[PDB]
Amino acid sequence: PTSCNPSDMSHGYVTVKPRVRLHFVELGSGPAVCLCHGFPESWYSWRYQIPALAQAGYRVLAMDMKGYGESSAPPEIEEYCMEVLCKEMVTFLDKLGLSQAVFIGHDWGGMLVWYMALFYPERVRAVASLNTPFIPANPNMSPLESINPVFDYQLYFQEPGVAEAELEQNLSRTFKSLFRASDESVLSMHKVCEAGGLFVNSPEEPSLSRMVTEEEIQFYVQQFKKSGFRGPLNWYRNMERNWKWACKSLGRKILIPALMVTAEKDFVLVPQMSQHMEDWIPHLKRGHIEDCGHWTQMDKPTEVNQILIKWLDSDAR
Amino acid sequence: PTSCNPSDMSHGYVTVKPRVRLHFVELGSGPAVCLCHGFPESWYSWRYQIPALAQAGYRVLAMDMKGYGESSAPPEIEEYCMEVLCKEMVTFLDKLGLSQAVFIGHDWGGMLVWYMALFYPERVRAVASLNTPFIPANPNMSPLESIKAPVFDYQLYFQEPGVAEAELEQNLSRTFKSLFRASDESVLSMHKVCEAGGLFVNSPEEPSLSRMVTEEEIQFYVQQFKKSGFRGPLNWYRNMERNWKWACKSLGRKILIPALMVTAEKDFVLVPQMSQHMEDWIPHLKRGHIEDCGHWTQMDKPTEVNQILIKWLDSDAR
Ligand SMILES: CC[C@H](Cc1ccc(C(=O)NCc2ccc(OC)cc2C(F)(F)F)cc1)C(=O)O
Numbered sequence: 297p298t299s300c301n302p303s304d305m306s307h308g309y310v311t312v313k314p315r316v317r318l319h320f321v322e323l324g325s326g327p328a329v330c331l332c333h334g335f336p337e338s339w340y341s342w343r344y345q346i347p348a349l350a351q352a353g354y355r356v357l358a359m360d361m362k363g364y365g366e367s368s369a370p371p372e373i374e375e376y377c378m379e380v381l382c383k384e385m386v387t388f389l390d391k392l393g394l395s396q397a398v399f400i401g402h403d404w405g406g407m408l409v410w411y412m413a414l415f416y417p418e419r420v421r422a423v424a425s426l427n428t429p430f431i432p433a434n435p436n437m438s439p440l441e442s443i444n445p446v447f448d449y450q451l452y453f454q455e456p457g458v459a460e461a462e463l464e465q466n467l468s469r470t471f472k473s474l475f476r477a478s479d480e481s482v483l484s485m486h487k488v489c490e491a492g493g494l495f496v497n498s499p500e501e502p503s504l505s506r507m508v509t510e511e512e513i514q515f516y517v518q519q520f521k522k523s524g525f526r527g528p529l530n531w532y533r534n535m536e537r538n539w540k541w542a543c544k545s546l547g548r549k550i551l552i553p554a555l556m557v558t559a560e561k562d563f564v565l566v567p568q569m570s571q572h573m574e575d576w577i578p579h580l581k582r583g584h585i586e587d588c589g590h591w592t593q594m595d596k597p598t599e600v601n602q603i604l605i606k607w608l609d610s611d612a613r
Numbered sequence: 614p615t616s617c618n619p620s621d622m623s624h625g626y627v628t629v630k631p632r633v634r635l636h637f638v639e640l641g642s643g644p645a646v647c648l649c650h651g652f653p654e655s656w657y658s659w660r661y662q663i664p665a666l667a668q669a670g671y672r673v674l675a676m677d678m679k680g681y682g683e684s685s686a687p688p689e690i691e692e693y694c695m696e697v698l699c700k701e702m703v704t705f706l707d708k709l710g711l712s713q714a715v716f717i718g719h720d721w722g723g724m725l726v727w728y729m730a731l732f733y734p735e736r737v738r739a740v741a742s743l744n745t746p747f748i749p750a751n752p753n754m755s756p757l758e759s760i761k762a763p764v765f766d767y768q769l770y771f772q773e774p775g776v777a778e779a780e781l782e783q784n785l786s787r788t789f790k791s792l793f794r795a796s797d798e799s800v801l802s803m804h805k806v807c808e809a810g811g812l813f814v815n816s817p818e819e820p821s822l823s824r825m826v827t828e829e830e831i832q833f834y835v836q837q838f839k840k841s842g843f844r845g846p847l848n849w850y851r852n853m854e855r856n857w858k859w860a861c862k863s864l865g866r867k868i869l870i871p872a873l874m875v876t877a878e879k880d881f882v883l884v885p886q887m888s889q890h891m892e893d894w895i896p897h898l899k900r901g902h903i904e905d906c907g908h909w910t911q912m913d914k915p916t917e918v919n920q921i922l923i924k925w926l927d928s929d930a931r
């Protein structure tokens with residue numbers, strides 16, 4: 297599948313607030329589709345989708361989400377609560393003169409596009425998540441309660457400074473370690489809080505996943521030199537704010553065209569978690585990629601492309 | 614008509630070759646429209662069109678043309694021959710994944726979009742020029758012939774690199790307050806320039822503020838031209854022989870795509886008359902004509918320009 301050379305892309309910049317600019321990559325003509333990567337990724341994560349969606353007849357905007365790459369990384373933890381992040385994407389649409397977009401998210405980006413679709417449906421022509429379910433907040437169930445102990449690692453991510461040091465230690469190590477097919481996996485997310493690290497019981501000089509080249513790893517590396525891992529990590533550090541915000545919607549369905557794409561071998565965002573999203577989302581269509589781990593876009597680019605274009609052309613165009 | 618705050622625009626950047634990026638401002642959704650300013654202007658020259666075209670249902674890309682503002686100003690004179698400038702706009706479309714655009718130009722921008730439409734029609738949905746006619750190159754008539762065949766004598770003053778740069782860079786506020794005037798406010802004679810040895814030599818020291826334009830607006834132009842100065846901009850004038858020999862290599866071939874010529878009654882350089890026989894060369898040409906409009910068409914008569922463009926866009930291009 298045709299990929300992206302960063303040097304050859306149209307680079308877009310939009311100030312959504314005084315010291316906060318959002319960077320995006322833009323390709324194609326037709327309906328606006330806005331791709332929102334997850335943790336700890338990049339617009340480059342969409343390198344296989346961008347050329348295909350443009351060819352399919354769509355105007356693709358591939359974000360650096362706030363904290364990442366060429367998008368500002370404001371120092372305040374509370375800048376990365378979903379509330380702020382969503383208002384800033386709405387301001388993004390306003391400044392580009394877009395009445396709406398299709399929002400397609402993965403991982404943390406998937407949680408953003410669910411919450412755009414929940415609170416700003418008038419601005420979202422249709423919504424799609426890779427891996428990430430939309431589970432409504434239980435107002436009787438606090439977040440620290442919810443940590444589903446697969447999610448214990450989120451506690452290690454809480455204390456500012458701590459996980460930054462691990463992840464910034466050796467950037468090549470970090471990304472070679474993370475960006476693996478599920479069968480190649482070198483770390484257990486279940487173990488993290490105990491071991492006191494993601495990487496403490498993983499190879500010193502990890503090998504290169506079949507999903508990725510050295511050059512692709514060095515691009516991620518080069519990006520995360522700019523602002524590091526604090527910004528990215530701060531998405532984890534607004535559980536109480538996000539919970540209280542999400543509760544303030546409580547009950548209201550998402551009536552816009554919707555797509556949930558599950559990955560058989562994401563052991564964190566497991567297909568099952570998405571099971572009763574129809575109750576909360578009447579017009580939900582489904583994709584499901586077999587032999588696909590967390591890193592859905594680069595694990596199974598051709599599958600992702602065929603599912604998205606099929607749903608786009610049927611539900612959004 | 615709603616204008617533009619630069620700080621609030623989406624800013625776009627595209628490398629069309631190693632040391633050469635094009636900057637543009639982007640607003641709206643629907644068919645791609647690409648606005649190409651003239652000399653010596655800016656994307657900001659389209660500040661009254663951009664919000665209106667976006668509102669009208671169009672995706673507007675408002676260029677800094679090569680040499681201007683945030684677009685690269687490569688030092689070589691022949692980088693600003695029409696050939697290169699057009700190839701680079703085609704590369705601009707390629708890198709944005711656009712099969713075509715509507716091209717709307719003014720002045721030198723107008724000459725670019727005529728030549729895009731001539732040599733790259735497959736990439737141009739439809740073409741519109743403000744003020745600038747499309748006169749085919751006569752292969753029996755050299756460029757230096759066409760000029761001193763006379764209103765265009767000032768183009769000779771623009772030739773020698775360094776010379777006109779010094780006048781125009783002397784005092785940027787002076788330059789822009791002096792130029793951006795309604796034709797009744799005019800403080801220049803363009804026909805005099807070669808004689809007097811200057812644009813401004815016989816014009817006020819501290820010129821007054823044209824009714825067309827505010828201090829803020831002038832200071833934006835000023836701020837932009839600090840980046841690269843006037844060499845890049847002026848180098849569009851310095852490729853007459855190259856442009857002539859290039860344009861002759863099209864000789865005869867008509868422009869079969871939807872086209873719009875907009876004449877300004879009071880542009881005394883790009884005069885309505887010059888556009889008179891463009892039908893022969895362009896079968897599908899529709900026409901606008903703005904009364905009481907000088908050279909600086911977009912800011913002189915924003916509401917007229919907007920109504921003509923959107924009418925033609927909606928009828929001929931969408
Ligand atoms: C259901 C989950 C949502 C939001 C949400 C929670 C956690 C994550 C998250 O940690 N994503 C990163 C991740 C995911 C899977 C992995 O598999 C190996 C690894 C990672 C990680 F390495 F941390 F980047 C992403 C989204 C919620 O909390 O409601």
Ligand SMILES: CC[C@H](Cc1ccc(C(=O)NCc2ccc(OC)cc2C(F)(F)F)cc1)C(=O)O
Pocket residue numbers: 651652653720721724745746748792803881882883908
């Ligand atoms: C017919 C003209 C075309 C190309 C062409 C020639 C000249 C110009 C040009 O000098 N435009 C700038 C200009 C125009 C009118 C003016 O009236 C006050 C003043 C200017 C100027 F001050 F020079 F910027 C712009 C385009 C050709 O050569 O075929």
